């Protein structure tokens, strides 16, 4: 990506407080607190151990990219959806989708179920999988 | 007794199903019909229950171990030839000229023998694209041939 | 031929798949044209009013093409079903034609009006004509029996059957009148014969609701022929005369015809000879029910009856002996009463007078019959009736013996032609001894009719070269016959029960169960009502044509005649010469036994010809039909055991669906079907044009016919179930993937939000 990167950097900048081009336990703890509650030592510790050596803007983009890897397109997903949208209305009836995910294929769980719909864009009975495919993607 | 490429086929399909009713290596005995209906065969409901099928979902699930013999079973069961379907349909033709009316055909399917929901009917009608003439009659010979043909001929 | 002689004798748009016969309530059957099938619910249109309705498919009857309108012989019709037959008859009937053949059976439908078809003009034309040569007629049946007896050299016989008021008698007479007019060699033999009816009918017929001239006795008359084929003698046999009508007559009914003739004044000279006042409504014994009779002139009938006694060759005394004994009866019922004493003597003398016995010695042996034993007030009035009835019975019997005297010309006899005019099976609200007698009679007749039907049967098992062997027949018939006639039978029990003065309606009833309850399955305790007003029943008999609940009350006197053995002594030595003979020097059942056997060995020595009479309606009016009644008669005329027969054409169409994986000619297709089914060569037979299935088998084929047809229908539904499933199989693989995308790709975005790094990242974002 190129705009995904532009952010990453500017981000790494705001995170790398002691502006030393590296991210340290104090760097993370620092900025977190300046905003919302921050992680405990143990959280911060294993949070760094996730990166072999020093956190230059490189090992950074490395672990972040290796996260977002192993996923499909916004087009590839929007279709796996329209695959249940026979009439091609660009919406799925809420009871339907919930039913699919819940007890079909690789059954979800109530939490997976709640976590998922806590965000979901459902209004008028129909769950718009387009808007939701975007939200979940780009 | 089945062959390998055969048993493999049972395997193939068993998955598509066992997955859809929640993947876990077990299939709802209420689907054992449709499973075999996919491997070509068309048993009769009377037929399926005989081997293990059930009237409702939830009732019970089955492994692939118990599944093998249900298919060994539903194999040795009688399939209807063209002769038979032609014979039976003749008994509703007073004219004798291979006709019948939509309305009556509908009656035969929905009302006689192991009934067929009103939906499956409008279904297959539309599928096979069966059409009536001005008098509202249809050549039952054509119809039987399509149904026999398959969804993809 | 425009010929006047054939006026009421000669017969003056159709889709074979649309047009048919559909049941009706008014007409019995209606002309319908099918509109739409629907499984079993056929929807037809009534051609008449043009209305519409539905009808079970198995209730439609096949119609015949206009090709067979008013057909003379019904065996030549395509369809012979209760609706084709009823239509053909009714068609002819409403056009004057009342005679129609159907195989070897002639059908006569009562005209209820006089027809110019019996004239001498017409008889001339039927002489020596072969049934197909000339229109259907009773003469033809008679003329043919003659030719057969002649050429075939054997006795002939006509059993003219039908319901009461149908035409049995009228037709029996026309047959004799016919045979008399073409085989003819006081008056002449031929003349006396014809003349025996007027006297026998006067003494043994009576107005009934059903028939204004109901025959109340069975008649079998044989007509002998000589070496030149001409009438050379004749005899008459009678059976079971209704003794009861003499003293009793249900409303709207009359007593025998004579009694009313006698009180009309046709011959005033006789009034003083009989001591009668020309008023019928004066005598109790004959004014209970009816008095007059629409279309019966008692005046003229009396004259003709008198006239007939002369031609029969009856001395004036003889025929005055008759008239007096019967007028005597008229008085026996005028004797009033009050142990009992008389209430006058005027009427009781006229009686002693006419019978040539002392009025004193009479009322004496009547009020204290002799060792003496007085009688009460009813024991008497009932022995009065016992006497009236018993006299009249003897009279009727002597009368016949005498008319045979006149006819048994000692001339030379070769063969003969009998004619049978008897009442058939009848089941009423209440059935007693009278009925058992008629029924027992009809049973033995049945065996006869069967024996013959079975012979024509085999005439078929050869017209197609399909010889059958030992079947299973009339065992139930013989079971009933035996239950009634054999050594310890019903009648034999009753006969041995009469000879005991001690006996009664209960020792007889018990003595019956004692012998057949559980030892013979035809004898069964009285069941439950199958008709309102169903009077008492003590037991039931399973007769060929029905189950009859018999009440045995009074059967002991019915069979033995309970008249003062005292008065039988008085009359034994009476002055009148007739009366003396009647009570000169073996009960109903016993006489009838010997009688029936006589008629049977007779009949079994003949080649029978059957005529079937049919009453068109209950109104006695001409040309009007009552389909229900008609149909009802057609029901079971001229079954039960004979193999099933099927034309390969109709067989293939109905039983192909039982082995269609063996059907690539109607006669070979079936050869295949029945072959496929691995059907036992036993349970069936070949045939040129038709298949013969042993008994029951066809019922069982309709079994398999229903089962297989259901399966096959299921199998095609299974086929439809499997097609729809497999059709949606692609849609089920694509969705299996399209779901795994979403399921695995949401679990990702789910776990990425539960990432410290991502969390904190998302936070910085702005
Ligand atoms: N061939 C006929 N022609 C004219 N009238 C007839 C004929 N046959 C029967 N009838 C009428 O119907 C009545 C009953 O006929 P009949 O022979 O006495 O009946 P059953 O079958 O009881 O002997 C007759 O009195 C007569 O009025
Ligand atoms: Ca499963
Ligand atoms: Mg730093
Ligand atoms: Mg009669």
In whole angstroms, what is the distance from residue C355 CA to residue C397 CA?
18
- Residue C497 host element (H or E): helix C490-498
Say which experimental method was used: X-ray
Q: Looking at the structure, do residues B10 and B72 belong to the same domain, yes or no?
A: yes
Length of chain B: 153
Residue C174 CA: distances (Å) to CA of B13, B19, C316, C388, C584: 89, 94, 29, 34, 37
Residue C397's contacts (CB-CB under 8 Å, 6 or more residues apart) are C238
Strand duo C29-36 + C19-23: pairing = antiparallel
- Contact between residue C146 and residue C127 where contact means Cβ atoms under 8 Å apart: no
- Across the interface, do B113 and C717 touch by the CB < 8 Å criterion? yes
Residue carrying the six token digits 């499973």? B35
- Contact between residue C421 and residue C215 where contact means Cβ atoms under 8 Å apart: yes
Q: Looking at the structure, do residues B75 and B88 belong to the same domain, yes or no?
A: no
Shortest-distance atom of ligand 1 to CA C164: 22
In whole angstroms, what is the distance from residue C585 CA to residue C118 CA?
47
- Contact between residue C182 and residue C127 where contact means Cβ atoms under 8 Å apart: yes
Domain containing residue B115? 80-151
Q: At C498, list the tokens.
A: 């009469």
In whole angstroms, what is the distance from residue C169 CA to residue C161 CA?
9
Q: At C698, list the tokens.
A: 């066809």
Phi, psi of A33 (to 5 degrees): -50, -35
Phi, psi of C29 (to 5 degrees): -150, 145
For the CA of C210, the nearest ligand:
1
Over the range C219-254, which residues count as b (16 or more CB within 10 Å of their CB) and which as e?
bbbbbbbbeebbbbbbbbbbbbbbbebbbebeeebb
DSSP string for C305-330: HHHHHHHTT--TTHHHHHHHHHHHHH
Beta bridge partners of C740: none
At residue C597, the 3 state secondary structure works out as: helix
In whole angstroms, what is the distance from residue C305 CA to residue C259 CA?
12
In whole angstroms, what is the distance from residue C109 CA to residue C211 CA?
15
In whole angstroms, what is the distance from residue C760 CA to residue A32 CA?
7
DSSP string for C134-202: S---HHHHHHHHHHHIIIIISEEEEEEE-STTSSHHHHHHHHHHHHHHHS-----HHHHHHHHHHHHHH
Closest CA to C113 of C550, C572, C466, C621: C621
In whole angstroms, what is the distance from residue C637 CA to residue C650 CA?
25
Is C208 buried (19+), middle (13-18) or exposed (0-12) by CB count in 10 A?
buried
Residue C624's contacts (CB-CB under 8 Å, 6 or more residues apart) are C616, C617
Closest CA to C633 of C617, C609, C610: C617
Q: At B74, list the tokens.
A: 């539903």
Strand duo C523-524 + C539-543: pairing = antiparallel
Count helices and strands in chain C by DSSP H and E runs: 26, 20
In whole angstroms, what is the distance from residue C445 CA to residue C451 CA?
10
Q: At C601, list the tokens.
A: 């060995």
Distance C169 CA to ligand 1 centre (A): 7
Q: At A102, list the tokens.
A: 């819940």
For the CA of C165, the nearest ligand:
1
Closest CA to A32 of A10, A53, A15: A15
- Contact between residue B65 and residue B30 where contact means Cβ atoms under 8 Å apart: no
In whole angstroms, what is the distance from residue C103 CA to residue C502 CA?
55
Within 8 A of B40 by CB-CB distance, chain C residues are 722, 726
- Contact between residue C417 and residue C225 where contact means Cβ atoms under 8 Å apart: yes
In whole angstroms, what is the distance from residue C111 CA to residue C117 CA?
12
Q: Which domains does chain A have, with CATH numbers?
A: 1-69 (1.10.238.10), 70-137 (1.10.238.10)
Q: Computed over its alpha carbons, how large is the radius of gyration of chain C?
A: 37
Closest CA to C128 of C168, C178, C172: C178
Q: What is the DSSP letter of C708?
A: H
Point out the domain boundary residue: B42, B61, B79. B79
Give the Cβ contact number of residue A67 at 10 Å. 17
Over the range C94-103, which residues count as b (16 or more CB within 10 Å of their CB) and which as e?
eebbbbbbbe
At residue C461, the 3 state secondary structure works out as: coil
Closest CA to C521 of C547, C552, C485, C555: C547
In whole angstroms, what is the distance from residue C201 CA to residue C218 CA?
11
Distance A26 CA to ligand 3 centre (A): 7
By alpha-carbon position, which residue is closest to atom 26 of ligand 1? C112
How many folded domains does chain B comprise? Answer: 2
- Residue A72 host element (H or E): none
Distance C714 CA to ligand 2 centre (A): 29
Q: Looking at the structure, do residues B65 and B99 belong to the same domain, yes or no?
A: no
CATH of the domain at B113: 1.10.238.10
- Contact between residue A97 and residue A127 where contact means Cβ atoms under 8 Å apart: yes
Shortest-distance atom of ligand 1 to CA C421: 23
Residue carrying the six token digits 């776990």? C751
In whole angstroms, what is the distance from residue C401 CA to residue C410 CA?
15
Q: Looking at the structure, do residues B88 and B143 belong to the same domain, yes or no?
A: yes
C165 is catalytic: yes
Q: At C615, list the tokens.
A: 């009453």
Closest CA to C545 of C671, C667, C447: C447
Phi, psi of C351 (to 5 degrees): -75, -55
Q: What is the DSSP letter of C337?
A: B
How many Cβ pairs closer than 8 A exist between chain A and B? 13
Q: Tell whether C527 is in a known binding site.
A: no
**CB distance from C750 to chain A under 8 Å?**
yes
Residue A53's contacts (CB-CB under 8 Å, 6 or more residues apart) are A59
Q: HSE (CB half, 13 Å, CA atoms) of C195?
A: 22
- Residue C223 host element (H or E): strand C218-225
- Residue C441 host element (H or E): helix C433-460
Q: At B60, list the tokens.
A: 């019970």
Within 8 A of C748 by CB-CB distance, chain A residues are 70-71
- Contact between residue B25 and residue B63 where contact means Cβ atoms under 8 Å apart: yes
Point out the domain boundary residue: B79, B100, B129. B79
Would you state the torsion angle of the CA atoms of residues C70, C75, C77, C81, taken in this order, to the nearest 10 degrees?
100
Strand duo C218-225 + C539-543: pairing = unpaired
Resolution for the entry shown, Å:
2.5
Residues C262, C268, C269, CA angle at the centre, nearest 5°?
110
In whole angstroms, what is the distance from residue A126 CA to residue C53 CA?
51
Is B59 buried (19+), middle (13-18) or exposed (0-12) by CB count in 10 A?
exposed
Q: At C590, list the tokens.
A: 């016993």
DSSP string for B108-122: HHHHSSS---HHHHH
Distance of CA C679 to the CA centre of its chain: 39
Q: What is the DSSP letter of C584?
A: -
Q: Looking at the structure, do residues B46 and B87 belong to the same domain, yes or no?
A: no
At residue C291, the 3 state secondary structure works out as: coil
In whole angstroms, what is the distance from residue C134 CA to residue C281 CA?
50
- Residue C570 host element (H or E): helix C567-570
In whole angstroms, what is the distance from residue C51 CA to residue C411 CA?
69
What is the sign, positive or negative, of the torsion defined by CA atoms of C370, C373, C379, C381? positive
C218 is catalytic: no
C414 is catalytic: no
In whole angstroms, what is the distance from residue C201 CA to residue C304 CA?
12
Strands (DSSP E) found in C530-604: 539-543, 546-550
Distance B16 CA to ligand 2 centre (A): 9
3-class DSSP string for C81-145:
CHHHHHHHHHHHHCCCCCEEEECCEEEEECCCCCCCCCCHHHHHHHCCCCCCCCCCCHHHHHHHH
C644 is catalytic: no
Q: Looking at the structure, do residues B117 and B146 belong to the same domain, yes or no?
A: yes
Over the range C109-136, which residues count as b (16 or more CB within 10 Å of their CB) and which as e?
bbbbeeeebbeeebbebbeebebeebbb
Q: Which domains does chain C have, with CATH numbers?
A: 1-12+65-186+606-638 (no CATH), 13-64 (2.30.30.360), 187-422+562-585 (no CATH), 423-561+586-605 (1.20.58.530), 639-705 (no CATH)
Q: Looking at the structure, do residues B147 and B135 belong to the same domain, yes or no?
A: yes
Q: What is the DSSP letter of C70?
A: T
Q: Looking at the structure, do residues B118 and B130 belong to the same domain, yes or no?
A: yes
Within 8 A of A116 by CB-CB distance, chain C residues are 746, 750
Q: Looking at the structure, do residues B89 and B108 belong to the same domain, yes or no?
A: yes
By alpha-carbon position, which residue is closest to atom 15 of ligand 1? C167
- Contact between residue B151 and residue C731 where contact means Cβ atoms under 8 Å apart: no
Category of C546 on φ-ψ map: left (φ > 0), alpha (ψ -120 to 50) or beta = left
Residues A126, A132, A137, CA angle at the centre, nearest 5°?
165
Mutate to test the pocket of ligand 1, among C113, C136, C165 (most ligand atoms within 8 A of CB): C165
Q: What is the DSSP letter of C6?
A: G
Would you state the torsion angle of the CA atoms of residues C532, C536, C539, C541, taken in this order, to the nearest 10 degrees?
-40
Phi, psi of B127 (to 5 degrees): -55, -75
Q: What is the DSSP letter of C65?
A: P
Spell out the alpha helix ranges (H) of C656-755: 666-676, 697-727, 731-751
- Contact between residue C340 and residue C234 where contact means Cβ atoms under 8 Å apart: no
Within 8 A of B116 by CB-CB distance, chain C residues are 717, 720-721
At residue C52, the 3 state secondary structure works out as: strand
In whole angstroms, what is the distance from residue B96 CA to residue C431 CA?
54
By alpha-carbon position, which residue is closest to atom 14 of ligand 1? C165
Shortest-distance atom of ligand 1 to CA C173: 17
Closest CA to C319 of C202, C207, C233, C190: C202
Beta bridge partners of C320: none
In whole angstroms, what is the distance from residue B106 CA to residue B124 CA?
11
Q: Looking at the structure, do residues B96 and B121 belong to the same domain, yes or no?
A: yes
Is C764 buried (19+), middle (13-18) or exposed (0-12) by CB count in 10 A?
middle
Q: Computed over its alpha carbons, how large is the radius of gyration of chain B?
A: 18
Residues A65, A71, A76, CA angle at the centre, nearest 5°?
135
Q: At A109, list the tokens.
A: 């769980």
- Contact between residue C219 and residue C172 where contact means Cβ atoms under 8 Å apart: yes
Residue B149's contacts (CB-CB under 8 Å, 6 or more residues apart) are none
DSSP string for C340-357: --BS-SHHHHHHHHHTTS
Residue C142 CA: distances (Å) to CA of C321, C431, C578: 37, 36, 38
Q: HSE (CB half, 13 Å, CA atoms) of C290?
A: 16
In whole angstroms, what is the distance from residue C382 CA to residue C580 CA?
23
CA distance C745 to chain A (A): 6
Phi, psi of B39 (to 5 degrees): -85, 25
C426 is catalytic: yes
At residue C626, the 3 state secondary structure works out as: coil
- Contact between residue C101 and residue C112 where contact means Cβ atoms under 8 Å apart: no
Strands (DSSP E) found in C371-410: none
Task: Specify the long-range contacts of residues C679-687, CB closer than 8 Å, at least 24 apart.
Answer: C685/C461, C685/C466, C685/C468, C685/C643, C686/C464, C686/C465, C686/C466, C687/C464, C687/C465, C687/C466, C687/C645, C687/C648
Would you state the torsion angle of the CA atoms of residues A94, A100, A102, A103, taken in this order, to the nearest 10 degrees?
140
Residue carrying the six token digits 């090992």? A59
Point out the domain boundary residue: B47, B79, B111. B79
Q: Looking at the structure, do residues B105 and B93 belong to the same domain, yes or no?
A: yes
Q: At A54, list the tokens.
A: 């020093």
Category of B42 on φ-ψ map: left (φ > 0), alpha (ψ -120 to 50) or beta = beta
Phi, psi of C612 (to 5 degrees): -120, 110
Strand duo C415-421 + C155-161: pairing = parallel
Phi, psi of C7 (to 5 degrees): -50, -55
Residues C434, C240, C543, CA angle at the centre, nearest 5°?
50
Q: What is the DSSP letter of C244?
A: G
In whole angstroms, what is the distance from residue A63 CA to residue A12 CA?
13
In whole angstroms, what is the distance from residue C11 CA to residue C603 CA?
35
Among C735, C740, C742, the residue to mutate for chain A (most A Cβ within 10 A): C742
3-class DSSP string for chain B:
CCCHHHHHHHHHHHHHHHHHCCCCCCEECCCHHHHHHHCCCCCCHHHHHHHCCCCCCCCCEECHHHHHHHHHHCCCCCCCCHHHHHHHHHCCCCCCCCCCEHHHHHHHHHHCCCCCCHHHHHHHHHHHCCCCCCCCECCHHHHHHHHHHCCCC
Closest CA to B147 of C730, C721, C713: C721
- Residue C623 host element (H or E): none
Residue C299's contacts (CB-CB under 8 Å, 6 or more residues apart) are C264, C265, C266
In whole angstroms, what is the distance from residue A5 CA to residue C108 CA?
115
In whole angstroms, what is the distance from residue C311 CA to residue C187 CA?
5
- Contact between residue C21 and residue C29 where contact means Cβ atoms under 8 Å apart: yes
- Contact between residue A135 and residue C752 where contact means Cβ atoms under 8 Å apart: no
Give the Cβ contact number of residue C496 at 10 Å. 12
In whole angstroms, what is the distance from residue C127 CA to residue C229 CA?
14
Over the range A1-21, which residues count as b (16 or more CB within 10 Å of their CB) and which as e?
eeeeeeebeebbeebbbeeee
Q: Looking at the structure, do residues B109 and B126 belong to the same domain, yes or no?
A: yes
Residue carrying the six token digits 């005679």? C99
């Amino acid at each position: 990506p190129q705009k995904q990167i532009q952010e990453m950097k500017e981000a790494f900048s705001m995170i790398d407080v002691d502006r030393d081009g590296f991210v340290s336990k104090e760097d993370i703890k620092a900025i977190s607190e300046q905003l919302g509650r921050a992680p405990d030592d143990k959280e911060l510790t294993a949070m760094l151990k996730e990166a072999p050596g020093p956190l230059n803007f490189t090992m950074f983009l490395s672990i972040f990219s290796d996260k977002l890897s192993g996923t499909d397109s916004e087009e590839t997903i929007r279709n796996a959806f329209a695959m249940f949208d026979e009439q091609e209305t660009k919406k799925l009836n809420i009871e339907y989708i919930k039913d699919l995910l819940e007890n079909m294929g690789d059954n979800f769980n109530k939490d997976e179920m709640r976590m998922t719909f806590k965000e979901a864009p459902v209004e008028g009975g129909k769950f718009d999988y387009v808007k939701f495919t975007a939200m979940i993607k780009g | 007794k089945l062959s390998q490429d055969e048993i493999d086929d049972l395997k193939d399909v068993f998955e598509l199903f066992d997955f859809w009713d929640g993947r876990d290596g077990a299939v709802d005995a209420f689907k054992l019909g449709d499973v075999c209906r996919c491997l070509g065969i068309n048993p009769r409901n009377e037929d399926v229950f005989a081997v293990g099928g059930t009237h409702k979902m939830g009732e019970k699930s089955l492994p692939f171990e118990e599944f093998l013999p249900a298919y060994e079973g539903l194999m040795d069961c009688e399939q209807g030839t063209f002769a038979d379907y032609m014979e039976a349909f003749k008994t509703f033709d007073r004219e004798g000229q291979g006709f019948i009316s939509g309305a009556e055909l509908r009656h035969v399917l929905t009302a006689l023998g192991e009934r067929l929901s009103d939906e499956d009917v409008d279904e297959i009608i539309k599928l096979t694209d069966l059409q009536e003439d001005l008098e509202g009659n249809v050549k039952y010979e054509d119809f039987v041939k399509k149904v026999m043909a398959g969804p993809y001929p | 031929f425009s010929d006047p002689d054939f006026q009421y004798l000669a017969v003056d748009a159709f889709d074979g798949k649309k047009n048919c016969w559909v049941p009706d309530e008014k007409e019995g059957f209606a002309s319908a044209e099918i509109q739409s099938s629907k499984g079993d619910e056929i929807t037809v249109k009534i051609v008449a009013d043009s209305s519409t309705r539905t009808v079970k498919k198995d209730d439609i009857q096949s119609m015949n093409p206009p090709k067979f309108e008013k057909l003379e012989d019904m065996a030549n019709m395509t369809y012979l079903n209760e609706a084709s037959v009823l239509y053909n008859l009714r068609s002819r009937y409403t056009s004057g034609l009342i005679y129609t053949y159907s195989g070897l059976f002639c059908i006569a439908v009562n005209p209820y009006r006089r027809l110019p078809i019996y004239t001498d003009s017409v008889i001339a034309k039927y002489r020596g004509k072969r049934k197909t040569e000339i229109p259907p007629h009773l003469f033809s049946v008679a003329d043919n029996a003659y030719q057969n007896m002649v050429t075939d050299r054997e006795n002939q016989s006509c059993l003219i059957t039908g319901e009461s008021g149908a035409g049995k008698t009228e037709n029996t007479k026309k047959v004799i009148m016919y045979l008399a007019k073409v085989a003819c060699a006081e008056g002449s033999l031929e003349d006396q014969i014809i003349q025996a009816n007027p006297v026998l009918e006067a003494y043994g017929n009576a107005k009934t609701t059903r028939n204004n001239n109901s025959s109340r006795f069975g008649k079998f008359i044989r007509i002998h022929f000589g070496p030149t084929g001409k009438i050379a003698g004749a005899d008459i046999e009678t059976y079971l005369l209704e003794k009861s009508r003499v003293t009793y007559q249900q409303s709207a009914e009359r007593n025998y015809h004579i009694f009313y003739q006698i009180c009309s004044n046709a011959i005033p000279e006789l009034n003083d000879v009989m001591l009668v006042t020309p008023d019928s409504g004066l005598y109790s014994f004959i004014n209970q029910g009816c008095l007059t009779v629409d279309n019966i002139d008692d005046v003229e009938e009396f004259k003709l009856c008198d006239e007939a006694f002369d031609i029969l060759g009856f001395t004036k005394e003889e025929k005055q002996s008759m008239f007096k004994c019967t007028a005597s009866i008229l008085h026996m019922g005028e004797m009033k009463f009050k142990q009992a004493e008389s209430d006058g003597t005027a009427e009781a003398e006229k009686v002693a007078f006419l019978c040539g016995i002392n009025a004193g010695d009479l009322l004496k042996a009547l009020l204290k019959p002799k060792v003496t034993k007085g009688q009460n007030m009813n024991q008497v009035v009932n022995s009065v009736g016992a006497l009236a009835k018993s006299l009249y019975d003897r009279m009727f019997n002597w009368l016949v013996r005498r008319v045979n005297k006149t006819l048994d010309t000692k001339a030379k006899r070769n063969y003969y032609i009998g004619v049978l005019d008897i009442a058939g099976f009848e089941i009423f609200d209440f059935n007693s001894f009278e009925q058992l007698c008629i029924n027992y009679t009809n049973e033995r007749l049945q065996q006869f009719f069967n024996h013959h039907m079975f012979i024509l049967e085999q005439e078929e098992y050869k017209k197609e070269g399909i010889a059958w062997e030992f079947i299973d027949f009339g065992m139930d018939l013989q079971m009933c016959i035996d239950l009634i006639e054999k050594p310890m039978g019903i009648l034999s029990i009753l006969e041995e029960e009469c000879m005991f003065p001690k006996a009664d309606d209960k020792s007889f009833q018990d003595k019956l169960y004692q012998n057949h309850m559980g030892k013979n399955r035809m004898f069964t305790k009285p069941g439950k009502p199958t008709r309102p007003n169903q009077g008492p029943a003590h037991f039931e008999l399973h007769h060929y044509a029905g189950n009859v609940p018999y009440s045995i009350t009074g059967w002991l006197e019915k069979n033995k005649d309970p008249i003062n053995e005292n008065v039988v002594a008085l009359l034994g030595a009476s002055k009148e010469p007739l009366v003396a003979e009647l009570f000169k020097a073996q009960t109903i059942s016993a006489v009838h036994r010997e009688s029936l056997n006589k008629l049977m060995k007779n009949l079994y020595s003949t080649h029978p010809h059957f005529v079937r009479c049919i009453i068109p309606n209950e109104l006695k009016q001409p040309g009007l039909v009552d389909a229900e009644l008609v149909l009802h008669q057609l029901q079971c005329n001229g079954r039960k055991g004979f193999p099933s027969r099927l034309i390969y054409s109709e067989f293939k169409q109905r039983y192909s669906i039982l082995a269609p994986n063996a059907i690539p000619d109607g006669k070979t297709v079936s050869e295949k079907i029945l072959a496929g089914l691995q059907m036992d060569p036993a349970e069936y037979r070949l045939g040129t044009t038709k298949v013969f299935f042993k008994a029951g088998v066809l019922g069982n084929l309709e079994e398999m016919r229903d089962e297989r047809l259901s399966k096959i229908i299921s199998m095609f539904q299974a086929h439809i179930r499997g097609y729809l499933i497999r059709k949606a199989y692609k849609k089920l693989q694509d969705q299996r993937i399209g779901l795994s995308v979403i399921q695995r790709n949401i679990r990702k975005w789910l776990v990425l939000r539960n990432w410290q790094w991502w969390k904190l990242y998302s936070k910085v974002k702005p």
